[model samples]
Target: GSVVGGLGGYMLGSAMSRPLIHFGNDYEDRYYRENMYRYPNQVYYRPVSEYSNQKNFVHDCVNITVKQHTVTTTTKGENFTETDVKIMERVVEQMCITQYQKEYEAFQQRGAS
Candidate 1:
């Protein structure tokens, strides 16, 4: 049951880290608060990129959404930098991880109780 042990350990770690991992609300809030200031009146986007990189594609896709980011700039010569776009991408990724952790914790609590 080595695989089982590894899986359990992963779940435990995720459950413990839910609050720190982040999720949708955090992304929305950051986009509205911080990123908006950085990008200024640009539309924020998330496209669910959380589970596409795993070996078990079926399992990975179970609840995770693979999120991506995009924003349009009106400034003709001032396109958004790759780094800036990446920050937006990271925000969505963090949000997905956070949401996953919350769900994992709920499952653990239910099983334990």
Candidate 2:
């Protein structure tokens, strides 16, 4: 009744910085685990799009694993909370998808011609 109905979630961030809460997709989470490839040290888990549609596989997931040893505000990522952040049983910070997606688009265009 909860996630089955919706993908996005409500706000749950404090310090009042524009509702830090960013609901995650149930399917995306399950799908992402396919390749929990980590890069940029232990703070971030950089995974590619789990989607199998289109050759231009987008959806670059740069997430901050739960139970952070010391999660810094270096990256402006969304605060994945509640059910979406259910993994690792802690809060996970997800960076902007648009940025990665856009980067991929640019790369594709650059190689075209």
Candidate 3:
């Protein structure tokens, strides 16, 4: 619940970085979709489940949809491997979070005062 809750700001360049993995309530994905109102262009969908249930809203959600695109990078002569994606994922995630936090906090403070 608290994890990806802050992601909407990051994608929007509003300045708030948070984790993509949410493990709070099982129904969190729905809360985000409804309340957050993230646009399709601003968000992404990752199918983390093998068997999804139509009964629950996010029964198939695997991760938060962010602006970060999945890209493959290779060294001069080497082929890109699975590990590259995993490594980049972590690096990008942290970078986004750091950038967002610096901007978001100031925005919130401005409103508070």
Candidate 4:
């Protein structure tokens, strides 16, 4: 059970950041506010490094959907930077990208079927 401390500590350390100036609602995905940390940290956790890197993956996916930010899953706040802020832009991109991409994939699947 002692290991749980590290686990909680890790997740607890990052989460919960701000709600301002993002366009997550435009595309109407889910919680660009929530993704403030969610998306920014995706690269830090190296989850982005997965499948040509999370950042890269997100970037590639970002291009697919155009700009569709979503402030639906908003958490809370800690602190951030321009780099962090820059990611905020892509954060919205990734969130909405995946969401719309998700629906879009379903659309294609539904179509070909």
Query: Which of candidates 2 and 3 reaches a greater TM-score?
Result: 3
Q: Count of backbone clashes for each model?
A: 11, 0, 4, 16
lDDT of 1 at 8: 21
lDDT of 3 by residue, 8-98 (tens): 4222333333334342555553443343322222222222122143222121111333223332113433453443334334333543444
The parts of candidate 2 lying over 4 Å away from their true place are 1-19, 22-60, 63-94, 111-113
**What's the lDDT for residue 99 in model 1?**
47
Candidate 4, lDDT over the whole model: 0.37
Which whole-number lDDT from 0 to 100 does residue 98 have in model 4?
Answer: 48
TM-score of 1: 0.28
Q: Candidate 2 residues 5-110, lDDT tens each?
A: 2223311112111112323766645533532332122222232233343222222122222323123212235554343334322223332333344434554665
Encode model 4's per-residue lDDT on 1-113: one tens digit a residue. Answer: 53222222211112222334444455323444445444532211112212443455455444322221112222223444444445465654545334434444453565367
Instruction: Supply candidate 2's per-residue lDDT for 3.
Output: 20
User: Residue 53 error for model 1, in Å?
Assistant: 9.7
**What is the clash count of model 3?**
4
In model 2, the worst 10-residue window by lDDT is: 10-19
Assess candidate 2 and give its TM-score to the true structure.
Answer: 0.23
lDDT of 3 at 55: 22
Model 4 regions more than 4 Å off: 1-76, 104-113
